[PDB]
Amino acid sequence: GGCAQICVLSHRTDNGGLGYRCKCEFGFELDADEHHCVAVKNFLLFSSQTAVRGIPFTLSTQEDVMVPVTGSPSFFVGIDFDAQHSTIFYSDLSKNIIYQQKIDGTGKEVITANRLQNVECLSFDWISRNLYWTDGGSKSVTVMKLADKSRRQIISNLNNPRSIVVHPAAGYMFLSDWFRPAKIMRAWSDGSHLMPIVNTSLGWPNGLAIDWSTSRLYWVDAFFDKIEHSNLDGLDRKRLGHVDQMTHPFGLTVFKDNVFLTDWRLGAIIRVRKSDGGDMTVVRRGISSIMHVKAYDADLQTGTNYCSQTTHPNGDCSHFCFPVPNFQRVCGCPYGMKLQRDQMTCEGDPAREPPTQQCGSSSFPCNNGKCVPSIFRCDGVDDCHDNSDEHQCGALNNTCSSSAFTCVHGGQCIPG
Amino acid sequence: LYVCDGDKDCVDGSDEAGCVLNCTSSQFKCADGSSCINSRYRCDGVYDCKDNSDEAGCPTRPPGMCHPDEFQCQGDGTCIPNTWECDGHPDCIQGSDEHNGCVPKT
Amino acid sequence: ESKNRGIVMGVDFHYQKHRVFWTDPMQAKVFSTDINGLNTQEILNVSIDAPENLAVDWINNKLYLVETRVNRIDVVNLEGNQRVTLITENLGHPRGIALDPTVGYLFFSDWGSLSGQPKVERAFMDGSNRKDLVTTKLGWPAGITLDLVSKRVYWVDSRYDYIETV
Amino acid sequence: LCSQKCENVIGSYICKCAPGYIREPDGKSCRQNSNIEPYLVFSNRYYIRNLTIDGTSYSLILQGLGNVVALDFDRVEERLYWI
Amino acid sequence: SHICAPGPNGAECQCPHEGSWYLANDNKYCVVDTGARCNQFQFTCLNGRCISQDWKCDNDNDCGDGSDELPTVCAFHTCRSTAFTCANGRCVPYHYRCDFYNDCGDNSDEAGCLF
Numbered sequence: 001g002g003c004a005q006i007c008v009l010s011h012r013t014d015n016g017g018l019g020y021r022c023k024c025e026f027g028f029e030l031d032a033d034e035h036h037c038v039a040v041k042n043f044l045l046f047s048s049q050t051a052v053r054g055i056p057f058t059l060s061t062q063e064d065v066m067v068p069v070t071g072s073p074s075f076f077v078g079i080d081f082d083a084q085h086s087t088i089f090y091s092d093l094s095k096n097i098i099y100q101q102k103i104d105g106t107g108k109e110v111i112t113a114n115r116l117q118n119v120e121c122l123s124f125d126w127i128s129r130n131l132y133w134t135d136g137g138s139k140s141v142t143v144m145k146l147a148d149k150s151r152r153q154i155i156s157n158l159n160n161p162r163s164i165v166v167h168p169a170a171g172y173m174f175l176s177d178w179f180r181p182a183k184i185m186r187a188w189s190d191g192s193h194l195m196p197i198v199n200t201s202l203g204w205p206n207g208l209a210i211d212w213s214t215s216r217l218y219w220v221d222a223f224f225d226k227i228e229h230s231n232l233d234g235l236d237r238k239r240l241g242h243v244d245q246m247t248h249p250f251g252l253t254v255f256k257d258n259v260f261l262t263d264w265r266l267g268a269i270i271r272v273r274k275s276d277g278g279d280m281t282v283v284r285r286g287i288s289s290i291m292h293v294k295a296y297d298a299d300l301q302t303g304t305n306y307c308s309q310t311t312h313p314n315g316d317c318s319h320f321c322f323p324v325p326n327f328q329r330v331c332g333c334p335y336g337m338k339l340q341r342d343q344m345t346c347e348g349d350p351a352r353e354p355p356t357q358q359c360g361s362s363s364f365p366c367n368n369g370k371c372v373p374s375i376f377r378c379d380g381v382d383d384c385h386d387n388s389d390e391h392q393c394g395a396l397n398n399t400c401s402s403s404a405f406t407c408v409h410g411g412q413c414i415p416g
Numbered sequence: 417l418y419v420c421d422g423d424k425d426c427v428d429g430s431d432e433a434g435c436v437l438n439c440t441s442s443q444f445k446c447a448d449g450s451s452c453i454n455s456r457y458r459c460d461g462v463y464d465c466k467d468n469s470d471e472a473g474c475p476t477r478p479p480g481m482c483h484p485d486e487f488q489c490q491g492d493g494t495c496i497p498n499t500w501e502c503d504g505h506p507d508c509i510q511g512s513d514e515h516n517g518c519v520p521k522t
Numbered sequence: 523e524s525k526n527r528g529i530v531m532g533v534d535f536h537y538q539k540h541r542v543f544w545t546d547p548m549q550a551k552v553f554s555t556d557i558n559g560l561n562t563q564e565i566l567n568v569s570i571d572a573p574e575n576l577a578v579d580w581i582n583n584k585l586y587l588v589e590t591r592v593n594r595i596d597v598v599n600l601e602g603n604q605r606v607t608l609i610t611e612n613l614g615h616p617r618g619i620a621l622d623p624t625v626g627y628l629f630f631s632d633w634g635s636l637s638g639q640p641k642v643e644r645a646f647m648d649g650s651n652r653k654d655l656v657t658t659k660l661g662w663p664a665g666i667t668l669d670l671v672s673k674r675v676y677w678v679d680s681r682y683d684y685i686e687t688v
Numbered sequence: 689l690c691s692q693k694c695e696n697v698i699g700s701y702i703c704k705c706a707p708g709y710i711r712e713p714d715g716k717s718c719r720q721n722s723n724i725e726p727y728l729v730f731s732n733r734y735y736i737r738n739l740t741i742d743g744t745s746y747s748l749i750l751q752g753l754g755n756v757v758a759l760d761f762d763r764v765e766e767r768l769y770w771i
Numbered sequence: 772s773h774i775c776a777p778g779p780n781g782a783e784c785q786c787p788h789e790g791s792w793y794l795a796n797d798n799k800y801c802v803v804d805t806g807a808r809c810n811q812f813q814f815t816c817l818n819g820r821c822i823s824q825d826w827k828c829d830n831d832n833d834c835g836d837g838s839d840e841l842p843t844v845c846a847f848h849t850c851r852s853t854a855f856t857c858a859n860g861r862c863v864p865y866h867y868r869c870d871f872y873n874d875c876g877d878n879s880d881e882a883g884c885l886f
């Protein structure tokens with residue numbers, strides 16, 4: 001049909017009597033001639049109990065831009081994106097795993113499955129290619145480097161941390177804690193400094209967003225039901241007008257002249273203007289347990305910093321490179337390691353940070369970096385989603401669980 | 417149970433014919449008569465039934481002031497919970513909720 | 523026979539290729555086979571977690587799927603290697619799908635749209651122009667089929683317990 | 689020393705505004721937070737008059753009365769009473 | 772700077788008896804007393820002059836004499852986290868790294884550059 005990617009039948013009278021139309025595969029979009037395809041720049045992402053999926057910003061079109069992410073069971077909460085590889089990162093609480101996946105559905109990989117309890121926010125730094133997440137069970141903020149899969153925990157002893165956003169150009173990290181007294185906190189990328197930038201008149205600061213056209217910070221509060229925005233020092237502060245039915249906001253993002261918001265009580269996505277509020281538009285309704293909203297933008301992830309310069313890569317740091325304010329870099333080492341006089345380089349620290357075993361005593365270590373109770377080892381079902389636990393069981397080397405049932409001739413075990 | 421609930425469970429609507437809604441005291445009824453909804457949803461900021469009757473007849477904030485179960489901040493004219501006044505933490509912009517007039521907890 | 527404790531939910535065929543296609547929501551998979559029972563293959567497994575019904579287009583060699591985890595109507599190649607989503611807007615409980623490639627019409631049913639109404643609906647095979655074909659005296663429409671010589675649509679309802687034609 | 693009310697300290701004082709008011713960075717002055725603008729109402733021999741506190745606007749509430757010596761108002765029912 | 776003694780917990784420093792003196796830079800340096808004592812976070816040179824501490828051991832002569840660059844300082848000084856370090860035991864700002872200029876004692880500032 002002269003189409004670049006896909007040709008689909010229409011009514012015989014449609015398209016001037018040609019009877020066909022052209023469509024582009026996931027991750028692609030249609031161009032002015034309605035025949036050729038171009039790669040998507042802008043689309044919105046949102047997460048919910050059942051699914052993580054993305055939709056276009058033009059409300060005239062309401063068909064998904066990416067292959068939806070869904071599994072059995074599912075409870076998605078935290079999401080971020082990587083544009084240079086057409087990838088999204090998502091966290092699942094029903095499995096306590098963080099995954100990376102491609103918007104065409106062709107790839108799925110596990111970032112980590114180890115020592116995640118209540119992860120309910122992900123942030124991604126694209127100059128250094130670092131991933132940050134918040135956990136409310138361990139009450140901590142953790143950072144990982146994806147090339148080496150190197151892990152360090154940089155903030156601890158928080159009360160109820162919820163949301164984290166990272167700014168690579170400014171070298172700042174922002175965090176929110178909603179245990180009374182609630183606070184919004186600023187840190188450096190390595191977590192070396194930490195200070196509350198907002199602690200007055202905050203009840204439930206559930207969500208944070210960054211505005212890049214102005215270098216400003218936005219937060220939404222569910223106790224007082226308000227949207228506020230400030231400058232990154234917290235010293236200039238303004239409040240947007242009353243949103244019509246917003247009564248328990250949770251998630252926030254900012255794109256061009258608009259601010260996008262999610263409400264639990266409505267189970268809805270709302271769009272208003274970031275300067276004033278108002279002009280309420282409802283993008284979706286009836287979403288079962290809607291959690292987070294995030295904006296995919298390839299242009300946002302353009303940039304350079306001292307960690308990314310081609311003539312001296314990774315800031316000469318061996319493991320971690322962190323941007324910090326006033327356009328300069330810092331180096332870090334993973335958990336089992338220490339820094340050397342030339343801070344570029346790392347060494348091993350068995351004194352202060354010895355090695356640790358994967359899962360402790362009363363659990364089975366699964367090959368994907370996950371821990372499950374010993375009773376589950378051969379109960380007949382894949383309690384570890386790599387199917388590690390049910391591997392080579394019923395054989396003479398591994399007898400089966402008392403909860404399971406065993407097949408007499410076969411020596412294979414099935415749930416009771 | 418199907419004889420009158422709200423759904424036409426058979427073709428001609430023999431069920432739901434001639435009913436009068438009689439929901440219990442734990443619920444609220446809406447002005448045009450179409451729906452009854454639990455009490456928690458009355459006066460919650462969300463229009464839970466058509467014609468907005470669940471939110472129409474609701475208390476409002478007096479002009480420039482706060483409810484008797486609230487506290488007001490001198491520096492910003494904003495309302496916070498009564499408990500927040502004098503609990504060691506400055507909630508107001510100027511921290512006026514932690515004034516010198518309060519007494520300790522042993 | 524459904525492997526690995528699965529079931530067969532929806533079935534559709536292609537005649538000039540000797541193929542039969544079916545859906546499994548317990549395995550979350552879509553399968554194709556030759557009508558002689560040989561040459562059996564799996565063609566979609568990435569996000570079809572609760573399929574119900576299939577339709578096939580024999581003029582353009584396309585396969586249409588109804589999905590309910592995320593309410594979707596999707597279009598693929600018989601091999602599974604190209605994919606599009608056509609209808610997403612108001613689907614609450616899509617259950618039935620039927621096609622006429624000669625005229626270029628798509629018919630589908632929903633027993634609980636997000637707007638609240640049960641619906642039987644007509645569309646263009648690309649999803650462009652949409653029309654409500656039945657809304658009066660309609661309960662739980664579960665299946666649609668077409669008569670192509672007389673150009674009639676037949677559908678079945680399980681709440682009001684009838685089989686009816688337009 | 690303070691607009692509205694103030695409270696004693698063993699070596700100093702502090703200033704506070706009543707409900708419905710905001711305290712400016714002066715630390716000693718109060719401003720009113722209602723969107724409603726105040727106005728003045730006064731009664732002449734034959735008339736009741738309406739005036740703005742900035743002196744910009746003058747108006748008549750009622751005319752042709754005999755000798756209006758006293759006024760008062762009621763907020764609850766939005767009423768005006770006179771002798 | 773002048774005289775050292777092995778006191779408890781470490782070394783102690785004393786200045787010559789020949790005049791009026793003052794102790795600076797963790798009392799490890801000796802200065803000749805005329806007042807004019809300097810502010811916090813600075814570094815001082817024996818000619819009685821004060822500079823921003825970052826210039827310390829930067830391989831540049833900040834003062835009328837090289838007190839800022841002496842081994843007595845740079846054997847114990849450590850480079851800040853946001854800096855770059857060379858085998859010389861010297862610290863340079865990172866943007867100088869691979870700038871086509873030396874800025875260290877060795878070629879290390881420009882060593883290994885991918886151009």
Ligand SMILES: *[C@@H]1O[C@H](CO)[C@@H](O)[C@H](O)[C@H]1NC(C)=O
Nearest residue numbers: 181196197198199200505506
């Ligand atoms: C609240 O934030 C201000 C910001 O300057 C800070 O000075 C103060 O210590 C903070 N209060 C608490 C209890 O952390």
Ligand SMILES: *[C@@H]1O[C@H](CO)[C@@H](O)[C@H](O)[C@H]1NC(C)=O
Nearest residue numbers: 434435436437438439440441
């Ligand atoms: C409503 O319920 C009350 C209490 O059972 C009963 O007395 C009354 O007759 C009922 N009215 C109708 C119309 O059902």
Ligand SMILES: *[C@@H]1O[C@H](CO)[C@@H](O)[C@H](O)[C@H]1NC(C)=O
Nearest residue numbers: 551563564565566567568602
């Ligand atoms: C999905 O199908 C492809 C193609 O046959 C196969 O390689 C892959 O293993 C399948 N994935 C799962 C999870 O079954």
Ligand SMILES: *[C@@H]1O[C@H](CO)[C@@H](O)[C@H](O)[C@H]1NC(C)=O
Nearest residue numbers: 761762763764765766767768
């Ligand atoms: C005039 O104001 C009174 C105030 O109590 C009100 O009751 C009445 O309805 C008003 N009438 C008109 C015509 O506005």
Ligand SMILES: *[C@@H]1O[C@H](CO)[C@H](O)[C@H](O)[C@H]1NC(C)=O
Nearest residue numbers: 115151335336355356357358
């Ligand atoms: C060991 O435990 C520490 C502290 O919890 C870290 O989680 C570390 O990641 C663990 N082990 C390994 C193999 O890194």
Ligand SMILES: *[C@@H]1O[C@H](CO)[C@H](O)[C@H](O)[C@H]1NC(C)=O
Nearest residue numbers: 374377378398399400401402
């Ligand atoms: C077989 O091993 C399982 C653990 O997988 C249980 O411990 C079970 O009690 C064992 N049973 C026998 C008979 O050894």
Ligand SMILES: *[C@@H]1O[C@H](CO)[C@H](O)[C@H](O)[C@H]1NC(C)=O
Nearest residue numbers: 474475476477478479480481
């Ligand atoms: C709310 O109640 C107050 C009295 O406390 C006033 O009557 C006001 O007019 C009411 N309505 C609004 C919108 O504030």
Ligand SMILES: *[C@@H]1O[C@H](CO)[C@H](O)[C@H](O)[C@H]1NC(C)=O
Nearest residue numbers: 502516517518519520521522
């Ligand atoms: C401690 O609290 C008790 C509560 O009954 C009393 O208020 C007591 O006066 C307090 N102690 C002091 C030292 O004031």
Ligand SMILES: *[C@@H]1O[C@H](CO)[C@H](O)[C@H](O)[C@H]1NC(C)=O
Nearest residue numbers: 341824847848849850851852
């Ligand atoms: C030198 O390094 C030590 C750690 O070995 C301390 O961090 C000290 O603060 C550093 N001093 C400077 C000036 O960088």
Ligand SMILES: [Ca+2]
Nearest residue numbers: 222225247248
């Ligand atoms: Ca609320």
Ligand SMILES: [Ca+2]
Nearest residue numbers: 376379381383
């Ligand atoms: Ca198991």
Ligand SMILES: [Ca+2]
Nearest residue numbers: 376379381383
């Ligand atoms: Ca189990």
Ligand SMILES: [Ca+2]
Nearest residue numbers: 418423425431
């Ligand atoms: Ca009924």
Ligand SMILES: [Ca+2]
Nearest residue numbers: 457460462464
């Ligand atoms: Ca309500």
Ligand SMILES: [Ca+2]
Nearest residue numbers: 500503505507
């Ligand atoms: Ca307080």
Ligand SMILES: [Ca+2]
Nearest residue numbers: 697698699700
């Ligand atoms: Ca006094």
